Design a protein around this nucleic acid. Structure first.
Lengths: 99, 61, 44
RNA sequence: AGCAGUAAGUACGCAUUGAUCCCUAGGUCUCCGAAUGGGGAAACCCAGCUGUUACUAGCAGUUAUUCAUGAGUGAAUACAUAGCUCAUGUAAAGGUAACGCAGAGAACUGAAACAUCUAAGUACCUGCAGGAAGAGAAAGUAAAAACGAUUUCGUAAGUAGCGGCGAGCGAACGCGAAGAAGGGCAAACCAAGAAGCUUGCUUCUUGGGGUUGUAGGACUGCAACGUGGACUUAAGCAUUAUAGUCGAAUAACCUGGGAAGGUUAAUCAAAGAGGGUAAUAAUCCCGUAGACAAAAUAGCGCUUAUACCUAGCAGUAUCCUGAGUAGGGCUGGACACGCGAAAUCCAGUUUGAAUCCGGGAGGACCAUCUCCCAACCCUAAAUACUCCUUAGUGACCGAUAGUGAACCAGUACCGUGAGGGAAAGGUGAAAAGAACCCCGAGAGGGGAGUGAAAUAGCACCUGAAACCGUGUGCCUACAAGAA
RNA sequence: UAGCGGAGAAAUUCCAAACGAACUGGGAGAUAGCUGGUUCUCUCCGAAAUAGCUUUAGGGCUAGCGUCGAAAUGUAAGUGU
RNA sequence: UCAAUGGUAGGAGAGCGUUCUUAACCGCAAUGAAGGUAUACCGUGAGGAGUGCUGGAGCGUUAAGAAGUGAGAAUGCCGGUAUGAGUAGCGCAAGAUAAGUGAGAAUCUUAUCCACCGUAAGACUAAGGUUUCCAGGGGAAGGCUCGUCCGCCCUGGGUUAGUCGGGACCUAAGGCGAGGCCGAAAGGCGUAGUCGAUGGACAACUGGUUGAUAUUCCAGUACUAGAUAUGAUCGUGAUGG
RNA sequence: UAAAGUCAUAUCUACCCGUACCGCAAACCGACACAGGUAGUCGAGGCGAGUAGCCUCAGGUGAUCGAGAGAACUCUCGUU
RNA sequence: UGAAAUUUUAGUACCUGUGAAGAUGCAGGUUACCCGCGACAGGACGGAAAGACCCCAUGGAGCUUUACUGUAGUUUGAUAU
């Protein structure tokens, strides 16, 4: 997409309908780590930067298909973009149009 | 080799009695001569056909 | 007994140096075969 | 909108202010290498000159050769000449995918052997060229009215022919299609000059003249047509590559680790091509169809005067029209053509015309007729092939295949060398890669936990097959079997 | 000093663990009357191993010997007794 | 009903199975496709499905078309596994004990004896090797066995010149060769010239020095050559001789 | 030919490459930690002409699977 | 510590016969508890060596010659120079 972002729905996949804030997408990964979503956990060794380890609630990224950006009234769809203003205006379809 | 005589020793092929499918080497006439002096003063080869047609136009050509 | 190659440095060159191979209009041709294939190196 | 190639992997950092990135242009461009100041084995050494700036430095450039063009020099020997010196011009040497052309050019074969043939003038090798090359404007074919440069394809048709007439090789004509452009010069002459100025010169330089077949030009007449053709210049126009941009149309339930699968419904429409998405999507995304966008970018094309040389025409004073040239002898070769009745063309060698009342061709050749005008030069187009640039297409192929090479392949490796030449992809969706605990020198294991799954644990999907096993019910330790 | 060659106190001796004609690439998948190999299932029918010629004798070319189809059935030929 | 059904090379006919087929026809699929595995079914055959289990994505139908299309067998090939066989060999010489080391010692280290070579099995030095050297650490393979050891592996250092060897000197043998020569071409020859050491030219040698460099680092002595600083004086004296 | 020369004098300089190790060898060339080949220079004493022996210099080395048991046999050795 | 060659698989005896004309495996008959282990060689027409002897191929190479064809080379003559 364009930079996510906001709370973002997850329609299909392991966790249906879950919304969660994003800023950290890195679209070259083409699947987005979102807090709360795809709860990975790592049994890490008691080593540097965690001298106990065994628990890392870092979470997995899931595909662009299961990312769904909502406009600010919680309404997702398809991003019509660049349409309105100086450089670019993002919106979804059937949406409240905000970014 | 001579320049204004055209070609060279050019290859060919020999025949015989009830021909035996053989080869020859064509050699033209070879004469180093220095005939004229237009500003010439230049020794070079020639062929005898061009010798007999030195009086054709060959004093400068 | 004695084997074939017990070469020295002059021995390993002087048949196969870049000007030796390049020299005779011929070895450079087979070097250009070695370039148009383009194996691990050229001159040796 | 993150960047911080490969990829972990780190750090200072860096960045919607506009980064990273994409494109275009400019920059610098280590050394070698055509490689070139000189030598030299490839990654070198040693220089000279000119300024620099300082040093028994460094910097920056110049210094290979051949050719061409000038300039100077000036031996035997006076001028000269050779020769030498300097200057100018990448010119140009060189690398090359395939096609071409030209030279040089075999053998093996086959012919049931083989000396003729064939293979083929092909393998190779060398040179010369471009986007194509050659190719070409009748000194043609043909045989009656018969056309009118070439080129490619089909036809004629294995037809005519040739050939130890074996084995084979092999036309052209005419027709059909594409493609369809011809134009200069020397010559003759005329004018200018200079000069054999030995005067009248009869050679050179310049510009007209005109490029010819039913002859044509020069001499007497006498007409301005765009033209790659009678200028394929420059200026605008337009549009394409060269950055990309927008770009429609959906929700729930069941299942599962996960829906796009099943079920329920709805939409769209120049987009239900295709690919991802944890499991098969039109409506999730990339996209897709369409619709926009480029300054520089390499072009293509259109209009413009210009970028320049041509016409008809009657007559015929004489000249011209392509000399060692045609031809003739011999030796070759190609032409279907193997010397033959042998055409016809091109070679060597020898001899050698005519020249417009001309000359040539019409398969030996002699007459009549038909056609043409060589012996001077250029000619697009239709054609051949791709290393290449994408746009792509597949009753291509799926890891012994498909390129030798899906993988750091021409790799490893062999060989001194020329050369040769391998093997190998897949965990899981996502490393979420097994924290911890215990055994163990360690590895490795075992629990725990991980994940949908751990026979799923790093060469990891799936897992036969030979091999080795461990357990298992029966039988065999008086037996000499294709079991 | 490099293969149509070389070297050679010479045997046919050697020319890079190696030669009566070296090695590498192409011609060219040279060729081979000689060797081997040939892959799914059924049914029906069913051999020869001889004459003649042949640079032919371990091979071909006919003819005799099979098979299938078609045209009639020399108006029966065939084959017996 | 009757008659036929041995059958090789031979010839005829027919059918099965695989894969791709846009075709359609028309499904399956996570409740499990394919594929594997056991299977005590059926089919004249080739062959076909049923179930149990693995397994987690494509496959099946039908009918027809098209085929790199039906696998034993060739010194077939490639890849894996036997076999012989726990047998050969363990690559030409003698170590020994104690102690350490470790976890584990025959084979690692030390001590102490023995032993061997000793015109060498010493030292030093060509070519060669191309870092193998040393230090520290480790033991996946390698070491023909073990292995803490190592030319094995990781990491890090280690080679020092006016005089040492070469080049900035010359030159043989030879090679290249502008000129020139001849040659289808490429070429091959070759005058000048050019490089080409194994040769001929020339100053440094004692002592110490590391884990390792020593004629190279430095103490002492030099000498060679040049430089700029400085009373010459006509001097240098060539490619010639 | 005038400090080109030139010596005294003074103090500096003197380039580039190679330099480690092994090298009769477990690094070379013999596919190998191989029973070959491989320049050259030195190369102890004691006897001893002797660089031949033979044992010890200096120096270096224990060279890579061993233990048992002493079969037959096989091969190197000593006897008759 | 640990290989090689090797092969249809085979729990592979003897006689006498037979037979592509010489048996382990066949017919008849005989003896043999089962499995080894150390040494040996008669077989298993043992391996390793698509016979290097002989023969054949319209096979090829090499060599020789007053085979036949040629070639260069050598030597005439013509003839441009």
């Amino acid at each position: 997409f364009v930079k996510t972002g906001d709370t973002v729905k997850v329609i299909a996949g392991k966790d249906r309908g879950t919304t969660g804030k994003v800023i950290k997408a890195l679209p070259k990964v083409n699947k987005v780590v979102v807090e709360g979503v795809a709860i990975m956990k790592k049994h890490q060794k008691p080593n540097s930067e965690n001298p106990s380890g065994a628990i890392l609630e870092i979470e997995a990224p899931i595909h662009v298909s299961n990312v769904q950006v909502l406009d600010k009234n919680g309404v997702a769809g398809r991003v019509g973009y660049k349409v309105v203003d100086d450089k670019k205006v993002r919106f979804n379809k059937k949406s409240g149009e905000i970014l | 080799e001579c320049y204004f005589t055209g070609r060279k020793t050019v290859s060919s092929n020999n025949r015989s009695h009830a021909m035996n499918q053989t080869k020859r080497v064509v050699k033209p006439n070879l004469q180093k001569v220095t005939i004229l002096e237009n500003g010439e003063l230049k020794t070079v080869w020639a062929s005898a056909k061009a010798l007999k047609k030195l009086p054709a136009g060959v004093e400068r050509v | 007994m004695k084997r074939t190659y017990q070469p020295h440095k002059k021995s390993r060159k002087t048949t196969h140096g870049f000007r030796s191979r390049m020299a005779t209009k011929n070895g450079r041709r087979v070097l250009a075969a070695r370039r148009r294939k383009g194996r691990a190196s050229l001159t040796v």
